[PDB]
Amino acid sequence: HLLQFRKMIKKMTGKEPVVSYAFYGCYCGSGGRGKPKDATDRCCFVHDCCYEKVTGCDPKWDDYTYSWKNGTIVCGGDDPCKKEVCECDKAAAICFRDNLKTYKKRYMAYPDILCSSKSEKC
Amino acid sequence: HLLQFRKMIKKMTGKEPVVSYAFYGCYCGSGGRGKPKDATDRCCFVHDCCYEKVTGCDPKWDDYTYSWKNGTIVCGGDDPCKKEVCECDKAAAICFRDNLKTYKKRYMAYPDILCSSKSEKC
Ligand SMILES: [Ca+2]
Ligand SMILES: [Ca+2]
């Protein structure tokens, strides 16, 4: 669920997820088109593609089971669709942390008109 | 950066870049489709293809290092991506100057639906 995803981004980056990531670049908001603007945005692009692959449950609005073991996020439960969603979210929140070095504030509420037409393929 | 591209265009063609070039043909505007209508538009098509080949930086918002040396634009800096962007802009500035003799005012704000369906490849 969206709020579990937000918990993981806050924990992994220290950044409050909504102003810092919900509108970043060409892919971090609802939708997405064009070419990813930088690595953070490319994290959002892989996360969008990861969600498109989920058949069987709602990626944005169902809850999954995860817990924190020794500094890392562990996706569990016995529903394979929900755990698949959890793995998308975990992967994106780690990717955000690893690309915190190139994070540009100029891309934080990026104008959708600046995103190319030619959308990158997954 | 876009503004640096515009300065090179004014200096090479003497025309004020937006009015004369920002909407020309099927490729000088944002996006582009169809085939190039003439040689100025093909300058724009090569420049769109040039920006598509750039990753690592942002063609529109990053400012690169360049200078004039004896009536020639010279791209420098030690960041290879940005110099590529500079090189893409310099070539189109020169290409618009070299094709001012077929610049058709009829293509100045050319309706994009008039552009053919099968886009040319880079
Ligand atoms: Ca998105
Ligand atoms: Ca164009």
From Swiss-Prot, chains A, B:
GO terms for molecular function: calcium ion binding; calcium-dependent phospholipase A2 activity; phospholipid binding; toxin activity. It is found in: Secreted. Disulfide bonds join 26-115, 28-44, 43-95, 49-122, 50-88, 57-81, 75-86. Its EC number is 3.1.1.4. Binds 1 Ca(2+) ion. InterPro entries: PLipase_A2 (IPR001211), PLipase_A2_Asp_AS (IPR033112), PLipase_A2_dom (IPR016090), PLipase_A2_dom_sf (IPR036444), PLipase_A2_His_AS (IPR033113). The active site is at 47, 89. GO terms for cellular component: extracellular region. It comes from the Eukaryota. It is an enzyme of class 3 (hydrolase). One of its GO terms (biological process) is phospholipid metabolic process. Gene3D superfamilies: Phospholipase A2 domain. It catalyses: a 1,2-diacyl-sn-glycero-3-phosphocholine + H2O = a 1-acyl-sn-glycero-3-phosphocholine + a fatty acid + H(+). Keywords: Blood coagulation cascade inhibiting toxin, Calcium, Disulfide bond, Hemostasis impairing toxin, Hydrolase, Lipid degradation, Lipid metabolism, Metal-binding, Secreted, Signal, Toxin. The keyword RNA-binding does not apply. Its cofactor is Ca(2+). Expressed by the venom gland. Ca(2+) binds at residues 27, 29, 31, 48. Snake venom phospholipase A2 (PLA2) that shows potent hemolytic activity, and exhibits medium anticoagulant effects by binding to factor Xa (F10) and inhibiting the prothrombinase activity (IC(50) is 90 nM). It is one of the few phospholipases A2 capable of hydrolyzing the phospholipids of E.coli membranes in the presence of a bactericidal/permeability-increasing protein (BPI) of neutrophils. PLA2 catalyzes the calcium-dependent hydrolysis of the 2-acyl groups in 3-sn-phosphoglycerides. Belongs to the phospholipase A2 family. Group II subfamily. D49 sub-subfamily. PANTHER family: PHOSPHOLIPASE A2 FAMILY MEMBER, PHOSPHOLIPASE A2, MEMBRANE ASSOCIATED. This is Basic phospholipase A2 B. It comes from Gloydius halys (Chinese water mocassin).
